[PDB]
Amino acid sequence: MKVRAQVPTVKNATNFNMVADSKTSVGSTLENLKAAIAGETGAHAKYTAFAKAAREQGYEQIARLFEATAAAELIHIGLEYALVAEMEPGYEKPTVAAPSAYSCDLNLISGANGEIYETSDMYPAFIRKAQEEGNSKAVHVFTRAKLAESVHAERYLAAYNDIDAPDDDKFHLCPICGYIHKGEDFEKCPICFRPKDTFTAY
Amino acid sequence: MKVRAQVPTVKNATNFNMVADSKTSVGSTLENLKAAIAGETGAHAKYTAFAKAAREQGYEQIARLFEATAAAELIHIGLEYALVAEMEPGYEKPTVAAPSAYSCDLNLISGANGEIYETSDMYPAFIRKAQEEGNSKAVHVFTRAKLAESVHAERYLAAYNDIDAPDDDKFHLCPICGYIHKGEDFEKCPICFRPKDTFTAY
Numbered sequence: 080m081k082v083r084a085q086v087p088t089v090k091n092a093t094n095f096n097m098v099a100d101s102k103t104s105v106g107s108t109l110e111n112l113k114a115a116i117a118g119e120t121g122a123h124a125k126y127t128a129f130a131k132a133a134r135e136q137g138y139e140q141i142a143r144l145f146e147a148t149a150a151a152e153l154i155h156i157g158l159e160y161a162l163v164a165e166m167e168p169g170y171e172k173p174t175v176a177a178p179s180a181y182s183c184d185l186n187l188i189s190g191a192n193g194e195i196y197e198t199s200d201m202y203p204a205f206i207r208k209a210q211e212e213g214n215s216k217a218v219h220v221f222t223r224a225k226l227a228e229s230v231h232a233e234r235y236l237a238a239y240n241d242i243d244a245p246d247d248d249k250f251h252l253c254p255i256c257g258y259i260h261k262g263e264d265f266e267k268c269p270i271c272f273r274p275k276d277t278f279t280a281y
Numbered sequence: 282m283k284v285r286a287q288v289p290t291v292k293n294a295t296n297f298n299m300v301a302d303s304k305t306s307v308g309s310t311l312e313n314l315k316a317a318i319a320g321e322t323g324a325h326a327k328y329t330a331f332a333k334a335a336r337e338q339g340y341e342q343i344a345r346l347f348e349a350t351a352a353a354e355l356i357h358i359g360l361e362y363a364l365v366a367e368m369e370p371g372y373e374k375p376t377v378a379a380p381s382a383y384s385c386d387l388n389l390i391s392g393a394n395g396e397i398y399e400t401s402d403m404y405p406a407f408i409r410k411a412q413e414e415g416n417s418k419a420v421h422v423f424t425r426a427k428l429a430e431s432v433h434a435e436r437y438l439a440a441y442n443d444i445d446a447p448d449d450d451k452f453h454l455c456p457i458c459g460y461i462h463k464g465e466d467f468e469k470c471p472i473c474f475r476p477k478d479t480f481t482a483y
């Protein structure tokens with residue numbers, strides 16, 4: 080993802096349209112934030128399991144990508160939980176069991192498919208509902224997660240295409256939005272402009 | 282996609298697995314070749330429509346990507362048609378009507394999803410059946426298409442992430458397998474080793 084002159088938002092970007100045949104149940108923004116957290120929690124468990132399998136399967140770099148992406152979803156959970164807690168103080172984050180893992184290549188595809196659903200269906204739907212209800216904070220959180228998921232999708236497809244051609248690049252994770260960069264060739268996060276110095280390498 | 286010491290095949294690559302819950306009806310290799318051609322023909326019509334819509338929407342570079350990918354599918358049709366013609370000289374390639382094109386970002390997602398289905402479901406299923414029936418010619422053709430589709434998927438996701446950050450890079454199409462590269466930084470096709478100077482620029 081290239082760095083634009085300005086931070087991408089639903090207002091200045093053109094990849095925020097939602098699929099017509101949605102597979103997303105849309106309720107109040109509160110309900111949507113909870114649904115997103117549940118999905119994020121499932122994603123974290125999924126990627127954690129995929130990383131474990133990747134290591135057993137002999138793909139150390141891909142394992143690191145799954146670990147970095149799992150960490151990215153934890154960041155999304157933190158952003159969404161902070162808002163939900165404010166909207167419903169006693170709210171308790173859900174626990175999701177580790178899903179089934181398959182061969183590394185298939186796990187990368189499974190990951191990409193989920194990321195695509197979130198960036199083109201779920202989050203855009205939630206963003207528009209938040210706008211409708213005037214919840215600017217939710218719009219911001221959903222936007223950041225949405226942008227990060229499409230980056231995750233691309234990273235997974237790149238890894239799939241080069242599954243037998245790994246390298247020693249590290250994956251740099253932005254602590255603010257979950258953006259992930261492969262390699263050192265970058266200065267800041269293209270999603271939130273966070274300087275590279277505060278990123279964490281995987 | 283990185284260039285390896287040798288061209289990728291089902292014999293030396295590890296991303297040829299078929300998703301366990303397949304959405305693909307598998308018949309004889311002859312039937313599968315015809316089914317693949319039908320899908321390729323539909324993809325060509327879809328990308329052609331998407332390209333036209335992209336230009337109307339002001340996305341010149343994305344339009345070029347859709348045009349290059351449409352051309353790539355025609356290459357796949359050629360490879361598959363040649364094999365069918367050998368067993369059934371009377372076989373005629375089908376023609377399909379053009380589908381609707383929506384907003385550019387969603388068209389890129391539709392493209393990516395189709396590419397992912399082909400590379401991780403349909404082609405792996407067809408390749409495996411061809412192997413079980415000892416049809417090496419079909420294994421070869423299905424492999425080339427399969428490898429190109431995952432590259433298409435990545436190119437589409439990359440364009441989606443940078444939908445508002447286009448550049449003047451040309452897309453280079455390999456005339457032999459449909460591989461597509463963005464920019465000039467490459468020496469040969471990572472799928473079939475065709476030299477860069479033989480590619481067609483879009």
Ligand SMILES: [Fe+2]
Pocket residue numbers: 119122151152155224228
């Ligand atoms: Fe996420």
Ligand SMILES: [Fe+2]
Pocket residue numbers: 122148151152194227228231
């Ligand atoms: Fe993600």
Ligand SMILES: [Fe+2]
Pocket residue numbers: 253254255256257258268269270271272273
């Ligand atoms: Fe960021």
Ligand SMILES: [Fe+2]
Pocket residue numbers: 321324353354357426430
């Ligand atoms: Fe194709």
Ligand SMILES: [Fe+2]
Pocket residue numbers: 324350353354396429430433
């Ligand atoms: Fe394709």
Ligand SMILES: [Fe+2]
Pocket residue numbers: 455456457458459460470471472473474475
């Ligand atoms: Fe090629």
